[PDB]
Ligand SMILES: [Li+]
């Protein structure tokens with residue numbers, strides 16, 4: 001029931017890695033930025049529904065980059081932060 | 084051992100919410116953007132060590148915004164994505 005980081009990462013890879021691989025790293029980063037912009041819009045509008053959606057999208061595209069780069073996000077977090 | 088999203092979020096709130104609250108939502112978003120820029124630099128340099136660090140930092144600041152906005156990131160993800 002409680003989603004693990006490792007499961008988030010592996011499930012996203014199964015869904016999106018083929019497409020992300022095809023487009024390449026810089027275009028995938030450009031999508032991340034597009035979604036960071038949508039998060040900006042959501043915060044500026046103070047629309048919690050939008051904020052909720054764009055937070056999910058920003059995480060999802062950050063995970064995409066982790067998957068393209070072969071980096072475990074859980075261990076990246078634990079290396080840098082006290083977790 | 085396997086870090087849950089809910090634990091990531093709650094632990095980050097304990098560490099950083101007071102400081103993030105003090106600075107406010109738009110300055111906190113500005114820090115997120117600063118780290119997205121560092122991720123850009125890391126990708127451009129193809130330095131995996133840097134990429135690993137900045138991915139962690141981008142997630143961490145995205146979680147900061149979720150905490151400031153009172154949004155559960157796990158449920159945000161599950162609402163938008165098949166997880
Ligand atoms: Li979005």
Ligand SMILES: [Li+]
Pocket residue numbers: 118121136137140
């Ligand atoms: Li950073």
